[PDB]
Symmetry: D2
């Protein structure tokens, strides 16, 4: 006799946490979210007992476009993860949100182009967000170039993003305290982004280089692979928490290839594709807040 499939009886359940504790028994994806909760509960309890599991967190730009950005930022502030891989949008949107917020719209594209509003699903980014971002990135580019001139070597993408967090601390106010990039800098959590020029930052850098005839500002990706892979190899155990697919999933999986794979994995994805590995199929905005709370906060 195996585990009985049963949902919560709502006359007896006393909290939403209690409802969610039944998810491992509900079946389908609820069962997967239930398994994810208690895979991460091990890793977190094991970490708090001084056991070394290096936690790799990967996400695509939609994660940062959404309100999950604040949950990611908290995870980094509280040192719940050790290594981040994301996309160009995952970096720049975290910075931009520290300047002006994104706005909830509705999933009239011709009107949006006329009004200069960038739409991400049902989330709107007005044009002045990118102008404000340029005001900060152009001086950041000059600083990166001077650092490279002083070092006589290019910065890697992760060093670039590390320097971004240092730059955020110097130039921004209280808004930086909900920033992933800021807390990664403060807690020395590297952020890898092998395609950091594929977005607004790259567009900024295009104008900087076109205006100033610069070819000396270099972003290297060859030396980050050593840094990322070594972080997986030198760990006694690794865990993978990957939201979405694309470059971050592939990079984290590929990095853990060398040590024979990650030792624990939680995948959350809408892309149709032991007890220590699970994928939850669904939108991370629905799933991730419940997962984090049940692992980090639930009593």
């Amino acid at each position: 006799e195996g585990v009985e499939v049963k949902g919560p009886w709502l006359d007896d359940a006393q909290s939403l946490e209690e409802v969610v504790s039944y998810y491992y028994r509900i079946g389908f994806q609820a069962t997967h979210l239930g398994r994810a909760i208690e895979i991460w509960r091990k890793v977190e309890e094991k970490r708090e007992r001084g056991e070394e599991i290096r936690v790799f967190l990967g996400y695509t730009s939609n994660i940062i476009s959404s309100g999950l950005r604040e949950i990611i930022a908290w995870l980094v502030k509280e040192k719940k993860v050790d290594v981040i891989v994301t996309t160009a949008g995952g970096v720049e949107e975290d910075f931009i949100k520290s300047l002006k917020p994104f706005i909830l719209g509705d999933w009239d594209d011709a009107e949006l182009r006329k009004k200069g509003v960038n739409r991400i699903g049902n989330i709107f980014v007005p044009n002045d967000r990118y102008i404000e971002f340029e005001k900060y990135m152009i001086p950041f580019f000059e600083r990166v170039l001077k650092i490279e001139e002083k070092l006589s070597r290019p910065l890697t993408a992760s060093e670039f993003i590390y320097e971004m967090g240092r730059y955020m601390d110097e130039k921004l106010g209280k808004e930086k305290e909900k920033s992933v990039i800021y807390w990664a800098y403060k807690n020395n959590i590297p952020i890898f982004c092998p395609a950091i020029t594929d977005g607004s930052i790259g567009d900024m850098l295009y104008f900087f280089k076109e205006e100033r005839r610069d070819s000396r500002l270099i972003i290297d990706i060859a030396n980050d692979i050593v840094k990322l892979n070594n972080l997986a190899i030198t760990a006694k155990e690794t865990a993978s928490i990957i939201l979405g697919g694309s470059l971050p999933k592939h990079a984290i999986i590929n990095a853990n290839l060398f040590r024979g794979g990650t030792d624990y994995a939680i995948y959350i994805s809408t892309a149709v594709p032991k007890a220590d590995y699970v994928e939850v199929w669904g939108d991370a905005t629905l799933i991730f807040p419940i997962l984090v709370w049940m692992v980090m906060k639930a009593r």
Copy 2:
């Protein structure tokens, strides 16, 4: 809308419900679940002031295969919905679960995703269905007319009441019979009930046990027409989503709609058709979405 996109800061949030209270301003599907909570809350307060809103609840068999069955039954027990349309699996698996439970999976075992239904579940179901068929035929001879599918399912709850003990009180069919909530299922013979009916008819050379579907369209369509307002809560696609939407065309459309499904429209399908500030679709597995939605509507404050 125009609200700033923002997630909860977990240094401040006190409970999971407060976390979920941010969903409307999180973006993507979280925003859709946030709007679904607002919609059903609005309908549920209006019902509690005595405002007539006829709630049509539709779901496919996978909902009943999952632990959501207990949540559906509670919603039926507490009269949160007025009309049910489901599929054959949605009916017969609710009965079967009141005899033996489904087993969580990764020898004659029926697998539904990661859910196991061992063969003795259906063997036990037949021990109840064969006498029930005899009762249905005896009813139809007494009435000199066939039972419609909803009448057949109502009679199935009465039979559950007489023949079963405690475990019927987690059952959707039982509570629908107890509360006189009609369950429509115009393809009731599509699964296990059909299989044993097949055995029943071969065994007794019977062609007199008739299940009519022509008269339930009057019953279901009139339930949509006669109400002042209707609300449509639909899990999945297929026959139930189509029947509830089709029934509500006779009144010009439902007044509130919450659809939860994993299907998409680009195959052109009903299951993927969109819900048309009182209409919303949440894309995802209902076993993840529905318990959050019901709790925040029926028990959050």
Copy 3:
């Protein structure tokens, strides 16, 4: 070793059929379509040599809404399938298309204009008004037949009589109709929820205006009918477009014989097991002629049918 993954070289490929003959070694869903072509070619050749394989064809309403309607009708005309299971829309829209065509639109004020939208397909309201002029006399014939026999028709008998009605009342248009050719060629069409659509809508009006409770459509006796068709066959094959009731009914019927002997499933629904998984078309079977092709049938099915039936 094994089959080398390889696409056609377009300096050498002479025809689209030659391009498609590479699909089995292209990988992903293209490999599955290649396997589906091989499976149905096998079934069709065995049938043409006199071996008995009862072919079950299932499809959802969308198949008939789309231009696949003409391809299904040709399959039924040529008796490439023996049994059909569909939904209410799959029946009624085939009849309607014999009266007035569906119109190509785009994927929302159509409601005041009285235009029903199915994806990027438009059905103007006069299609249903015209359909009603035919259904009301048909309902009256159905009632007379049921009074004559003192028994109700099943859905399959109802649909068979619909085809006889089309033969009597229509001209050349019926020659593109699934319902006409199924009646004409003695191919049963099962539809266990035939009231869930426009037929049921007009039956509601017919029942309301006449205060009728006597027009009965039975579903309990077709399951004997449908299940015996699967049991008595020496072999069966299941070609199923989409999900819902038709997929479940054909698989459920074939449970009684230990599962179908050949299966080709085409659906946009992502099975739990995987889009590339073996298991999806292997369900309900108890024993390598099983394949699922993931995608829109309007893309896949015309290629499959041509390569199986017409490519030389």
Copy 4:
């Protein structure tokens, strides 16, 4: 009120091409594929009559894993596209396939047995381990050549120059099999291949061993100067067309490069991700793309 929804009648239709010529009026995704055929025929016919339309081709690694690799290579050989954006897998699997083919993973093998045998599984496609050993045989000397070029120029190569040099290297060291390679024909036809995350894959894995064992930090792959090259190719064009298979970095990069000019002038997207010179065909590109290319480029 418009076009009548109608499929082909198989008593009349004489060819598969004739069957596919009904796709525009079949509805759903068939209609989108018919529209994609019309759009690309328009682009191609304009190009054949001298009109400047810069064609950006984007695809993810699954495209090159599959048999579509031969079709992409033909498009590049015949100069049907002007700019390529792909991923690391899209680059390195094209090179590997010129060494040893990929194998159809037709049977059911559990991944534990696959890993014992050293077989990498990509969907239903198998890459046996000796493919990567043979790849390393060629990539280590290529790394050494790249470093010498960098020392010679006193500057790093960008990713697109790296891939261009990969094509030159293929032409020097490989035989007839290179004639079915995207990288080779892009080099011969001076078609740039952009890949802003070229180290996230097998090339990156071998560079790791190269750098780790040689304590090298001098071999650089720059991406800052490629965004200039790519964006200029879109801004300097009179008109642009985008043909994008799948999502990920290539789709984002091509859309981003066309942002400055108000977007591409024609777009054909083919993807499985759930979202009149612009169309998306929802489905597997291995099903759709061979039909689209034949009907655009060869159906007469």
